[PDB]
Design a protein around this ligand. Structure first.
Ligand SMILES: *C(=O)[C@H](Cc1ccccc1)NC(=O)[C@@H]1Cc2ccc(cc2)OCCCCOc2ccc(cc2)CCC(=O)c2ccc([nH]2)C(=O)N1
Ligand SMILES: *C(=O)[C@H](Cc1ccccc1)NC(=O)[C@@H]1Cc2ccc(cc2)OCCCCOc2ccc(cc2)CCC(=O)c2ccc([nH]2)C(=O)N1
Lengths: 232, 231
């Protein structure tokens, strides 16, 4: 996991991504085709996304897209067998089990899950991706941005008592996650491999580039994920 | 009023409400039976709802519903006799052809006094069968807790659209949505649930970081009680 066949070259004020360079970025779309959230493939049969996305098994996992306006793309529409919502908002994390495996390719593969003990220290420049607004407006083409992790102490300076230990803040650096980005990945380089550290959760009503966006802290949630995978 | 027989346990990113626990909440359904708006029983003979819901006598008030995908519920489909519109405020009153039978699941919400103070920061509730996602509509009644905003904070989002006769709530991770219109924004004064807002408008995408806008029942209730006694 964690090593795209197509290497990334490095959301408000982000940059257009190399097509297929984020092969774990899926798009979550209702039956009509409307993208309402992002998600991340963790393996052939599983997608991780935000709980608040309210995903049901009538919705569709789309993997392989770069341009949501194009139709000349070799994408996969994957049905959702089961939905697993964290029952501890709170912990904006939800697992999706796919009805049929995703076929992995150049443009479709998995992100690495961290070990719960992993240390992605404040100040590490990580990357977030998605089709969220670029301007507070939804882009057709997958966007990406580099941005630093905040310590939870430094985050509470903007958000106060809201930032729980199972959350992590990134940004406040001239870029920001925005509407449409939710459920998508914030990833950091760990031992040469892209590892899921955040799930796009919430942030500024206006996606202000000087306010930290808030993400479900994946390390804090990964045992829950593993438990879910083992019993399913 | 404002004291549901079945006690509440505490719309996008809300939660499923306990069956029958918002007994004043009615569905407004057209002649095909399609749910188009919410409303609130204020007595056995009257429902308050939104003007923009365009209710007519061909529409129907449904009381005692929780799950519209269920048929085993003892519901009352109540004919509307007359629709009274507030002239020049997004409120309309419905007078029913036959009185609504009150029970554990059907009863009335309380009405404020015009001078009542419901300060910003109060935790209130809105309820409804409106979209849970911007079909994304629930069979089962939804509820959500949310803070009243001051009008001056609200104008940070909506500017001059915010009139004194409006009250804002939310921008707090939940949102009223399409299909919620006309239904209640209630607050628990002296232990009793009291209609403080009528779901009216707000974010076109039901943004949970945007305050919803509700008709401020305090500025309207004199007209409500006046219409009632006169009619
Ligand atoms: C999803 O696409 C979008 C991503 C995003 C990221 C950064 C900036 C802007 C947008 N996210 C949202 O629209 C989220 C959805 C959401 C997330 C978590 C959640 C509910 C809804 O539960 C956790 C709630 C804890 C946070 O609670 C609050 C409540 C109020 C405020 C902040 C946090 C102040 C209002 C505010 O800025 C706000 C409210 C909701 C969101 N921001 C939000 O981003 N919703
Ligand atoms: C009803 O079911 C639905 C519930 C709801 C609540 C909160 C958010 C989203 C949905 N309400 C609506 O769809 C309302 C109906 C409505 C109510 C009053 C009214 C018009 C329409 O007239 C007086 C209110 C002033 C209208 O002001 C605006 C506000 C915003 C905009 C234009 C005009 C920008 C577009 C927008 O967000 C918008 C337009 C209509 C509604 N939102 C809306 O919520 N309709």
């Amino acid at each position: 996991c964690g090593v795209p066949a197509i290497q990334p070259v490095l959301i408000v004020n982000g940059e257009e991504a190399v097509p297929g360079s984020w092969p774990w970025q899926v798009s979550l779309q209702d039956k009509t085709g409307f993208h309402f959230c992002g998600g991340s493939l963790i393996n052939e049969n599983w997608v991780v996304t935000a709980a608040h996305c309210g995903v049901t098994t009538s919705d569709v996992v789309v993997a392989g897209e770069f341009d949501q306006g194009s139709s000349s793309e070799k994408i996969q529409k994957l049905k959702i067998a089961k939905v697993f919502k964290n029952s501890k908002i709170n912990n904006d994390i939800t697992l999706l089990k796919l009805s049929t495996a995703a076929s992995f390719s150049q443009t479709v593969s998995a992100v690495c899950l961290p070990s719960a003990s992993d240390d992605f220290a404040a100040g590490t420049t990580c990357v977030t991706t998605g089709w969220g607004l670029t301007r507070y407006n939804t882009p057709d083409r997958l966007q990406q941005a580099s941005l630093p992790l905040l310590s939870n102490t430094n985050c509470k300076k903007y958000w106060g008592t809201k930032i729980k230990d199972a959350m992590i803040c990134a940004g406040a650096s001239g870029v920001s996650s925005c509407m449409g980005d939710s459920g998508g990945p914030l990833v950091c380089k760990k031992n040469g491999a892209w590892t899921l550290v955040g799930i796009v959760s919430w942030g500024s009503s206006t996606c202000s580039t000087s306010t930290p966006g808030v993400y479900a802290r994946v390390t804090a949630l990964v045992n829950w994920v593993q438990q879910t995978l083992a019993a399913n």
